[model samples]
Target: MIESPLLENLTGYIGGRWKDSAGGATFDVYNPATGSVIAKVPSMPEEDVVAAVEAGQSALRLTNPWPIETRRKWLEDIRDGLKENREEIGRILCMEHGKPWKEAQGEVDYAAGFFDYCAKHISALDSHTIPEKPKDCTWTVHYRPVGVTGLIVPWNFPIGMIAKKLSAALAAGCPSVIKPASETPLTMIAFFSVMDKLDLPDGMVNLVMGKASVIGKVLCEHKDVPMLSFTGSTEVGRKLIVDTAEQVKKLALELGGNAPFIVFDDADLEAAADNLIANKFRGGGQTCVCANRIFVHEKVADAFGQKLAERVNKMTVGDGMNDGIDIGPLINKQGFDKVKRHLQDALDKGASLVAGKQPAELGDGLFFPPTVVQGVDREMCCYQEETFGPLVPMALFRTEEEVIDAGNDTEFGLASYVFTADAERAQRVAAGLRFGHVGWNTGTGPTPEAPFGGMKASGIGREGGLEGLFEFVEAQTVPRG
Candidate 1:
C-alpha cells in the first residue's frame, strides 16, 4: 500500500468516526498504472448508508445555525489544509486514478481553489432586499439550507468534483453525505483525514464508500436527504431522476458531455493544435468536457490534422509515477475496451489513422496510445459516443453553420470549444453551439467564477459561482408593509 499520513482512514466515515462495514466485506482499489492492488476499502452496505444520512441530519442542526464568518473559516481551513498536504494527496491520486503526476497536483490546486472561491464569495449568497420593487412595502428574498445533501462524485475527477459540490453545499448551510467514486476512494479518505483536524461536529461531512448501485438507491430513497448533487453519466442521471422523484428532492447533476473542438479556416492552426493537446489529452481524455469530437474547417483540415498528428506521435505513454511520461493508463479495462470499441468502429467505417498503432497491436497495460484519426463521420462510434479515452477523431466542415450544427447535434450538451481569430465568428459559434460551457480561442472548461452545468440531457443545476450555492438552498420571498 502507498505510505502517506493522509491515507490513514481506509475505513468508511459515518456519524463522526471511521468505521468498517459490519459484514466485513471489502474491495481492492487497484493502481491502474501497474494493475496492482494499492489499498483495500470497506465495501459499505445499506446499513452504513443509513448511518451517513442520519449523521447528515444531525450535523445540519449545528451547521444550519453557523454564522457566515464561521462557515468562511471552515472553508478557509479546508483550502489551507489541501494546499498544505497537496503533495501527499496528489501522489495518492496519481497512483489510483492514473493521471500524470503533474495533472494530479494540478487537481489539488483546482480542488482547493473551489473552497477558496466559496469562502471569499460567501456573502454573494446572502439574502438581498428588493429596494427597487416598491416604496409602499418591503420586499426581500432569503436563501436557506434545504437540509442534508447527497454528493455523488465521478471517478474522472476525484477531489475536484467533491470540492465543487461540497463547497457550495456547505456555503449554503447544507450538510453533506459524500459518496466518493469506488475506483478512487483513497483521495476522499485522504481528504477526510485532512478534514478531521477541523474538530467539526459529528456529521458535518460524512463519507460512505461503496458500490454506487447499492448506496445511491439508499441515499436517494432516504427521506432525510433532501438534496443530491451528482456528477457522472447521463444514464445514471436518468436513474436518479426516477430514484428521487418520490421525495421530489432537489438535485444538481453534471452529466456526460460529448464536447466539440472546432477550428475554423481563419484559426491559427499551430495554436489550435496546442490547445487541443492541452485539453483533450488530460487524464487521457477521460474527462466529460474533453474535446471528444474534433471539427476542423475543410480548408484547414489537412494543415491542422498534420500539426496535431505530429505532436500526438511524440507523447509518451507509461506509468504516471515515472519521469517524462505524458499520458497514463486508462482507469481500468472497461475504459480501455471503450477506447478500443470506438477506434475499431471508426477504423472499420473508413476513418484512417494518422498516428499511433492499432488497438490490437498495442502492448498490455491499460495505456491507450495518444492516437489521431481523420475522416470521422456521423456514423462512427467515437463520433457519436463520448470516447473517454485518448483517441482523437477528426471531422472536416466548410461553413461555420455546418460546424455549429454538427457540434449541437449530440444530445449531451456539457461543453464545446471554438478556435478562430474572428471575434464575431467566435461569438456566433459560441451562441450557436448548444453547450453549457464554451471555450473561445482556449480549451479550458469550468472555473469557480462561472456557473457550470448542462442544458438538455447533460444535467440540471449548476456548480461553482453564486449559482452553485442556490442549488442547495430554498429561496423564500418576504413582503411586509
Candidate 2:
C-alpha cells in the first residue's frame, strides 16, 4: 500500500486548471518495483491536446515581451520551489518510476540545478551591434524567443529531462506545452503543482498526458506550436520531423544513444570498473547515455572483468522504496524482455557470464539482476542494439587505433568513455573518438556548463550549457542607415 499525495491529483493541467479528459477515458499507472496499479490518469483526447496548444500560444504572446530580469527572477523562484518540495517529489519519483530513493533525490536536485544555471546564464545571451560594416551601413543582431514550444519528455530521467528542456524554454521566454511520457507522469504532475502555486501567467506551462499515438501527432502538427524540443527514441523523433515537415518549424531533438566505455591497460583497473559500474547500472541502465559497450585492453581485460564482476555481484536489487537497495526494477515488462533478449543473444554467441543471473524469487515485478558478460563481439545483438537495461557486455581490445575504430563502428555516437593513467593518451583518445561527449577516466557525463548532444545518429541539437539556451531563440539581423 505505498502511496503519495500526488495521487490526489490525477487530472491533466491545462490553462492553469486541473481538468479530466472530455471522453472520460483513463489509464492506470504501475509501480515497476511491485508491478501494481498505483494511480489512474486521464487519457486525454485530441481536442484537449489542441486546447493545450491554444493556451500555450496565448501564454507565449503575453510572456514574449516580459523583461529579461522578470524571467530571471521567476526561474529563481521555480528553483526555490523545487528545493522546497525536493523530498516529496523524490518520493513520488521513486514510487512511480522505480529509481532508488537517493538517485531520485539526486534527480530532484539536478533538475533544480538546471533552473539555477539557466536563470543567470540567460541574461548573458548576446545581441550585438556591428559598427564597422561596409562604409556607412550599420546593423544589429537580436535574439528573440521562438514562439509556443512543445516539449515531449522521456520517462527514464523524468524530472531531470523535463527540467533540462523546460528550464531552457522558460529562460528564453518561450511558453511551453509539455507532454510527460505516459508511463510516468506523476512526478511531472507533482512538479506542476509546485509551479501552479507560483505567480506565473495563465497557460504559461501546460501539462498533458496520453499515448503517443493519441497526442504526439497533434503536438507535432499543430500550427501554434512553431518550435519543438523532444527527448525520446530516434525512431519516434524521425517520425515527428516528418509529420512537421510541411510547417518548417524549429526543432531540438535529444534522441537515442549507444555509448562506448573504453579501458586501457595502463588505467587503474579498480577505478575503471567502479566508475563504469556506477554509470552502466544507474536507473537499471535505462538512461540514453548508459555505457552500451565496454572495450578493455587484452593485457588487463581479465583483471578489469574480475573487478567489475565483484562490484556487480555486490549490488542489492529490490523495491526502490526499500532502504539500502542499490538497483531498482526496469521501467516495465517490455524493458525487462529487452534485457533478457540481449543477455540470451550474448550467451548464444559464446559469451561467458561473469556476474548476475536471472532472479527466481523476485515474483512478477519487472526486476532483473545486474549482469556482466565477457567475450562479447561486434556480431552480437547487445553490441548492435541499445540494451537499455543492466547488462554489461565486455569485449577485449588490442590497441588504441583498434578500440577507437571499433567504438566508432556504431551508427549512434551520443557518448563515449576513456580510462587511462597517461594524460596525453587520454587527450589523444578523446580527440580520436567521434562521440559528442567523452569522459576521461570516469563514467560521469554532462554538466550544466558544458554542451550535451550527439554527433552522428545519436541526436541533433544540444541541451544544457549556453548552446541549449540558443536553441530556443531565433537570430534576427536589423540594418540601420
Candidate 3:
C-alpha cells in the first residue's frame, strides 16, 4: 500500500471539507499494474452532485465575488502548490493511473503550466475596450463568469485533463463542481489537498467522485451550473448534446480522436519513426491524440517500417514504477479486451505483425507488448475503431492525395501529423487533413500557449491559451445613448 498524506482522505470533498458520500457508499480504486485495490473512495449518487452544485453556487454569491486580481492570485497559489507537491503528486498519478514515473511527473508540470499561463493572462479580462464607438453613442463591453461550471474529466491523464478545465474555469472567475473518473480519482483528490490551503471562499472548488451517469446527469440538468466542460469519449459527448440541450447550458466537450500520422517519401525516416513511437505508445497507447491510423508513402514504406519496428521491439513493458519501463498496463480488463480483439482482428484480416511478439495473457490481462502491424486494411478492427492500445497498424499510400483522403476518412478529427522535408507538402497536407491541431514534423500534442480542440464528431469548443479562458465567460455590451 502507498503511504502519503494526500491519500489519507478517501472521502469526497465538498463545502471546504472532506465528507462522506451519502452514508458512505464506496467503491475500490485499483492499481492498474497489480490490479489490486489501492483505495476505496466514495460512491456518491445524485444527491451528492446536487450538494456540490449548491456549494459552487454559494461560492459564486460571495459578497463582491472574487475579483480578477484575486482569481489570478488563487491560480498562482495553486500553481505553486502543484510545483511544491510535484513529486508526491507524480507518485500518486503513477500508482493509480499507471503511466511511467517520468511521464507522471511530466504531467504534474504540464498541469501546473496551465495554472501558470491562466494566472498570468486572467488580468486581461477587464482590459477589453471597444475599438471604434459610433459618434451617436458610446459602447462598453466586459466579460464575466458564466456561473458554476460542471467539470468532468477522464482518467487517462487524471490531473492534466482536470487542470485543463479547472484552470480555465477558475481563471475566468467561475467556481467548479469537479468530478474525476472513478478509475483515477486520487490525483485530483490530491490536488484538492493543494486547494484546501487556498483562501478562496468555501466550496469554490468542490470534488464529487462516484458514478458518472449519476453525477453527470445531475450536473447537466442542474439549474445552478450554467456551464459544463467534459473530456471523454465521442459517444458520451454525443449523448451529452441531447441532455444539455434542454438546459441550453454552455457546454465545452473535448472528445475522442483518430489522429492520423503520415510519413511522406521525402520525410526523414528516423525522425518520423521517433515521433510515432513517442506519440503512439504513451499511456500504453491510451492517448486520445495517439496516431491511430499510420499512413506511410509506398516508395519509402519498407525502410520506414523497418525503422519503426526496431524501436518498438526494444521497448520495455512492466509496472511503470519500475525504472526504464517504456509501457504500462491497460487501465482495466475492458481496455485490455479491446486491445486484444483489435490486434486479433488486424492479424485475421491479413495485417502483418511487424514488431513485438504477441505475449500470453498476463496478470489481469492488463499488460500487452508495444506492437506494430503493417498492411492494415479498412476491414480490420484496428482500422475501423480507436484501438486505444500499443498496437500500431500501418498502411501504405502511393500518392499525397491518396494519403490525405485516407487520413481524413474518419469521423474523428482531433489531431494529425505530417513529416516531410518539403515545407509546401507539409503545409498542403496539414490543410487537407480535416483535423483541429496539426503537427508539421513533430508529434507534440496540446500546450498552454496554443488553442487545441476537435472538429466534426471529435467534439467542440476550444481549450488552452486565451480561447480556453473565454470558454467559461460571457461577454456583455452596454451602450449609453
Q: What is the lDDT, from 0 to 100, of the residue 402 in candidate 3?
A: 87
Task: Mark the regions of model 2 whose C-alpha exceeds 4 Å error after superposition.
Answer: 1-3, 62-64, 358-363
lDDT of 3 by residue, 1-481 (tens): 6668977777778888888556768888899888789888879878878888888888884347577788889899999989989989999999898888888988999999999999888865773567777976678887778999889999989989998998898887788999888989999889998789887678789999888789888988888889989999888888888998878888898999888899988999898899999999888889888999899888998898899889988898899999999988888888888888888887777888888665344344488898888989778778878989998989888888888988888888899999999998899998888898998899888899788999888888999988888899889887778
- Indicate the residue-level lDDT of 191 in model 1: 94
Clashing pairs for predicted structure model 2, backbone only: none
Alpha-carbon lDDT of model 3: 0.86
**Total residue pair clashes for candidate 3:** 0
Compute each candidate's TM-score over C-alphas.
0.97, 0.97, 0.97
- Candidates 1 and 2 compared: the better one by lDDT is 1
- lDDT of the candidates, in the order given: 0.89, 0.86, 0.86
Model 3 ranges with Cα > 4 A deviation: 61-63, 359-364
> Tens-digit lDDT track for model 2 on 189-290?
899889988888788899888878978888878888888899899999888889889999788888888888999989988888889988998888998779
Candidate 1 differs from the real structure by a C-alpha RMSD in angstroms, to one decimal, of 1.5
Sort the predicted structures by TM-score, highest score first.
1, 3, 2
Quote the lDDT for 246 in model 2. 93
Residues forming the 10-long window of minimal summed lDDT in candidate 1: 58-67
RMSD of each: 1.5, 1.7, 1.5
Provide the lowest-lDDT 10-residue window in model 2. Answer: 356-365
